[PDB]
Amino acid sequence: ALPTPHEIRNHLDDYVIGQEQAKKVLAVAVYNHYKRLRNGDTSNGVELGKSNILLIGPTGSGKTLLAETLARLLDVPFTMADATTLTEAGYVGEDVENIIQKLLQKSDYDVQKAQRGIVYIDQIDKISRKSDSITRDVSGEGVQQALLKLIEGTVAAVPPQGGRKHPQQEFLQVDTSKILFI
Amino acid sequence: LVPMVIEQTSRGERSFDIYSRLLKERVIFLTGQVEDHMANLIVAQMLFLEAENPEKDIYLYINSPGGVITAGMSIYDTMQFIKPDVSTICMGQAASMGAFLLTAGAKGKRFCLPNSRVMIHQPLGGYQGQATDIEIHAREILKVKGRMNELMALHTGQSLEQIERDTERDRFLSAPEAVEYGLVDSILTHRN
Ligand SMILES: Nc1ncnc2c1ncn2[C@@H]1O[C@H](COP(=O)(O)OP(=O)(O)OP(O)(O)=S)[C@@H](O)[C@H]1O
């Protein structure tokens, strides 16, 4: 017996005040996530799509709070990364694989269990283009282009346990079509 | 005061004066009396457009009561030297020198507005001094009068004898008469 949207909403009421519309979105979205997982395109419903979430609000309202408190009652693996520490491929800053890597630390390197997890991103506006093109932006628009394929679904390469050193030269392939992003 | 406009481009937004925006499109304005400063400014504009593109037509709008002769002849020689066809349009009025630059435009690309007016007369001058000096300045202005009539006939197609009789005194020519006179090619009544 999985939790209902009303049950999970009451759980969040004990940690959030003055947010009705936002609770309904995460409750309905997380609920549908379990159903999409329960039927891995094996039932009559084939090719079950995905629907991510985009939270918008002022600072200090509880956006970071919802991501942490939600992981308590969910019990599936959850992580939290920062969009600020990202750049286009070929630059030292770019660590786009780290987000998937982090998820495995929480799941104890369980690929079958990491695909069924949830991920959250904070400070997404930091990479909005400034419409300045006559130059190349390592940070900003450039970063968004790399995330396109990651959300839709693909198989990123992850260094095992973050990579021991260069001699191994092997990577971990983990499907991402089923992973949710908030 | 000159109004400022914004030219939307892929690189970004740029602010331009109304006169500078039209200059980018091969358009030059000839306003007021023709003097050494105003004439020397238009010459630099024509040369700038020649280097940017030598195959695109230039448009010259003239609204002027005339002025110095020497200042105007610098523009005429420039229009003939450069390869691009300098299209001329008459707005409001075209005096003696304004008319000479009007007819000096490229053949087939000369227009006159339906209510425009052209006026032509002989060169004006004067001198004060010894009789020997008056004879010199008289011979010089006579050469200019003869020279200005020869070029007028070349572009208008009329005979030199006809230009001499018509330029003895002030002669106003309406827009329809200018076409019949060979001064212009057609009239831009409406946009088709
Ligand atoms: N809806 C809310 N209800 C109750 N308390 C809230 C709410 N939103 C924010 N708070 C309080 O504000 C604190 C900080 O909220 P945050 O989750 O950091 O907001 P934030 O938008 O995520 O800030 P960032 O991550 O720097 S953009 C929380 O620990 C709560 O005490």
Give me the CATH number covering residue A140.
3.40.50.300
Report the distance separating Cα B53 and Cα B72, nearest Å: 24
A39 is in which domain, residue-wise? Answer: 1-182
A69 lines ligand 1 (CB under 6 A): no
Ligand 1 centre to CA of A65 (Å) is 6
Contact between B11 and A134 using a beta-carbon 8 Å cutoff: yes
Smallest CA-to-CA distance from A176 within A26, A46, A50 is with A50
Q: What Å resolution does this PDB entry report?
A: 4.1
Smallest CA-to-CA distance from B74 within B46, B104, B105, B40 is with B40
| CATH superfamily of domain region B1-191 | 2-enoyl-CoA Hydratase; Chain A, domain 1 (3.90.226.10)
Report the distance separating Cα B41 and Cα B37, nearest Å: 6
The technique is cryo-EM
Domain count, chain A: 1
Q: What are the residues whose beta carbons fall under 8 Å from the beta carbon of B38, sequence distance 6 or more?
A: B30, B32, B71
Q: For a substitution probing ligand 1, which of A14, A64, A66, A125 has the most ligand atoms within 8 Å of its CB?
A: A64
Residues of B in contact with A131 (CB under 8 A): 12
A131 in contact with chain B, both atoms CB, cutoff 8 A:
yes
A133 CA to chain B: closest CA distance, Å? 6
Q: What is the DSSP string of A53-111?
A: ------TTSSHHHHHHHHHHHH-S-B--EETTS---TTSTT--HHHHHHHHHHHHTS-H
The tokens for B98 are 């304004």
- Nearest 5°: phi and psi at B30? -115, 100
- Nearest 5°: phi and psi at A79? -145, 175
Report the distance separating Cα A162 and Cα A21, nearest Å: 38
Give the residue carrying structure tokens 């032509």: B120
A56 in contact with chain B, both atoms CB, cutoff 8 A:
no
